[PDB]
Amino acid sequence: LLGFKIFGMPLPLYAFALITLLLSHFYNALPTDIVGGFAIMFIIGAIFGEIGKRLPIFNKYIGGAPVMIFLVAAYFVYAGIFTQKEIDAISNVMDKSNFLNLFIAVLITGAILSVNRRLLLKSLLGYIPTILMGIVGASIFGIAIGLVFGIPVDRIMMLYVLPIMGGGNGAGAVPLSEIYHSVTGRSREEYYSTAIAILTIANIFAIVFAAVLDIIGKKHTWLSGEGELVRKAITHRETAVGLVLSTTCFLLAYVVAKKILPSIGGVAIHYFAWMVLIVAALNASGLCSPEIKAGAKRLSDFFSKQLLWVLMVGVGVCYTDLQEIINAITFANVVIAAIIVIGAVLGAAIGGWLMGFFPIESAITAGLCMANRGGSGDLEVLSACNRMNLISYAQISSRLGGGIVLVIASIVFGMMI
Amino acid sequence: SDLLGFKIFGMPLPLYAFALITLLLSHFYNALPTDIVGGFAIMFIIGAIFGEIGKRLPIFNKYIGGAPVMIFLVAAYFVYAGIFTQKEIDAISNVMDKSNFLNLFIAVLITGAILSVNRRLLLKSLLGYIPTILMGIVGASIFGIAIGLVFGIPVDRIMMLYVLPIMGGGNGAGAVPLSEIYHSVTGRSREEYYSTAIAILTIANIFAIVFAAVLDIIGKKHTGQITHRETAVGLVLSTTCFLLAYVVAKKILPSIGGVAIHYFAWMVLIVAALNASGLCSPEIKAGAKRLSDFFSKQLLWVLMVGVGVCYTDLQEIINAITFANVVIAAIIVIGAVLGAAIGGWLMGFFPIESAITAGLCMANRGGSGDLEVLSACNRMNLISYAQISSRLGGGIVLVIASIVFGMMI
Ligand SMILES: CCCCCCCCO[C@@H]1O[C@H](CO)[C@@H](O)[C@H](O)[C@H]1O
Ligand SMILES: CCCCCCCCO[C@@H]1O[C@H](CO)[C@@H](O)[C@H](O)[C@H]1O
Ligand code: NA
Ligand code: NA
């Protein structure tokens, strides 16, 4: 028990914090600010984070730590566990103080500037277009099954395709909700609650088809290269600069979307979308030295691994409706989702074949590793089919491709609305 | 080419330009989110340029304060001169007060500064080094009050605007939090207090390094393991220890007597207790330190942009550069010297050495000063002691201040 850690805190220490939480709770004394917010969010997220991480079935196939937190957290608002004050504190961090944006800003920046200048520019020509091909196939098949299921083209694109292809929960579902609310007007929690649910279904199908394409690859060897895609031939300060660039790149994106270039056409370009383009540009410009480029990564790690659990406590409070989540686990979606994955498989297989890669390998990295739950999923997918050596490719899909999906989404959303 | 090798806030001039261009686009277009992201974006960039400028200036850097002073003055001049936009003022203030980054900042500092100190060193230090510090404070107060009564300034003002701020651990750690405690207990604006306190404190800092060389002449005449996670736990403990302090001050123990105990004061006691309890492993204890470094070294400059905007009046700063104050300040330092000399003699230390570490290294500008003081007298090997004064002693000063303030009011 003492050797057991919660969020890297021994049980004795965690108790100290958990006691404090309860003192604030009983006495109903809590500042509705950053400090008060994080204090709660950290502790609550910590316990339920570990709980969702330890659970076997749940951990590998549902999402684990983050899912457990954003569900539990929402149940606290539903069940009336939280105090008005505590809800205020948490919401004040997420929306008023706008930690959500910072979080996403840091992620975008670190994910894009991490990728090496050459790898990025090179990847564009072959691997990037394959990804786009996968998306086309994912959309075309999705729309096809939706039209068969009497669901309009809007919904299929916004609540199924885009969210599935997006890079997971924190990186796809969460920011797509924000873009959705900024462009339609409808609540975020309506969207996230459905999107997170479908996305998770697809994540389970992605790891299943990964093993199916492995069997097909080993049965029909002319399609699979044995694990090879192609057919032929720092200190605090750096990390701090990452933070500067994270915010600065968001501000530029913001000034562009609000004043300079509000709309390429009728279509309104959301500031997050712009950011991806800006950061990507900043990478190619090479204004950032490799040390700084890593600094940005080191930040995104710190956020993704330490502050993610905090974020989820807030996501369950503001972005999560437990009812819509339940309502989206319809047996019909399970089919729609699965088929969209298949659309991505065939889309990336065709695309990669056209770009010079092996169809099987392309469908795994530029296809399934897109439809999977961002990073966590890449590991789980590439293990089902033994292709763990392409992890570097898979992350290009989950990172750059996930960034693509936001830009695409900002356009899809607007023009559709 | 050489310029391009020139870095601003660890950003090459080309890169900084990218940011500085963005700042100006936000400025011209008047498009800026009044939130964390928008705030830090500005504060980072502005603080960066003026931070370096104040750091490079020779006279200014060593004796006035340097990077942070330059920023909190320039920043205030921007509000005064109307350089900043209402939006930009809002963004920055929203980060400092609404979002309350100030408290987090102080919370992180307190936690990392106290939990860094080794359990034994802390408990041991209490018996001998700590009481010496208290003796120095007594002497600093008694001499201060003496000169103030001579100058027709009441005992309140001497204790609140001169003694406490001087003995406190500098700008970010003493002056800035003492303003917060002052405003929480009197009701009067923070900027009124900070603007005077920062000014006197800086004067004393210059006297401290001078007397350090004077006492030198009189003396000669007569685990390393770390992870992001540990640092993150530092953040948890920083906030958690503030929350406990807060719940205690607001509900459990609002007042020991008529006197109201401010939550920051409680925090110091709580964190110190948490250290002695040893609930925190050395890895975690370092984690808290590693955070406070990241804050103190990276986010300090941001903080100062906000301190010039909310906590700084340029007029009161000018008005406190009183030649009368120059005398009052100097004497308070002398009071600390003799106070720590007597105290240390009683505790078994050398009077000269005690007056330097438990005396001048108190009255100096926190950590920054300790280096400048221990260089004037060649005692650089006591830096570890000096930091106990600047850290633990600075924490003491807040607890004392919360009591002094309340009972006086
Ligand atoms: C027990 C293994 C199950 C495999 C199912 C497919 C059975 C064989 O499949 C057939 O094999 C031929 C090669 O000889 C191919 O030319 C055909 O395209 C293929 O469909
Ligand atoms: C409000 C957000 C504050 C984020 C600050 C995170 C700074 C963490 O910074 C990290 O600290 C670690 C611990 O020493 C080091 O090992 C890493 O190299 C360093 O970059
Ligand atoms: Na996906
Ligand atoms: Na001082």
Numbering used by the authors:
A (entry chain A): 18 to 250, 263 to 446
B (entry chain B): 16 to 237, 260 to 446
Paper text:
The 2-HCT family of transporters generally translocate molecules with a 2-hydroxycarboxylate motif (HO-CR1R2-COO−), such as citrate, malate and lactate across the plasma membrane, and activity is tightly coupled to energy provided by a sodium or proton gradient as a form of secondary active transport. Our crystal structures reveal that the KpCitS protomer is formed by homologous N-terminal and C-terminal halves with inverted topology, each containing six transmembrane helices (TM 2–5, 7 and TM 8–11, 13) and one helical hairpin (TM 6a/b (or HP1) and TM 12a/b (or HP2)). KpCitS protomer can be divided into two domains; a central dimerization domain (TM 1–4 and 8–10) critical for formation of the dimeric structure, and a peripheral transport domain (TM 5–7 and 11–13) containing residues needed for interaction with citrate and sodium ions. Our results show that the KpCitS has a homodimeric structure in which its dimerization domain remains fixed during the transport cycle due to a hydrogen bond network as well as extensive hydrophobic interactions, while the substrate-loaded transport domain undergoes an elevator-type translocation (i.e. up and down) across the membrane.
Citrate-free KpCitS yielded a crystal diffracting to 3.6 Å resolution (form 3) with two inward-facing KpCitS dimers in an asymmetric unit. The dimers are practically identical, with Cα rms differences below 0.3 Å, suggesting that this state is structurally stable in the crystallization conditions. In the citrate-free inward-facing state, we observed that one water molecule takes the place of a citrate (right). Since the substrate binding site is continuous with the cytoplasm, water molecules are able to move deep into the membrane inner leaflet. In addition to the changes in amino acid conformation polar water molecules also seem to facilitate release of the substrate into the cell by breaking the electrostatic interactions between substrate and transporter. Conversely, D112, E195, R205 and Y348 form a salt bridge network in the inward-facing conformation, blocking entry of substrate from the periplasm. The conformational change to the inward-facing state relocates L408 and M417, opening the substrate binding site to the cytosol.
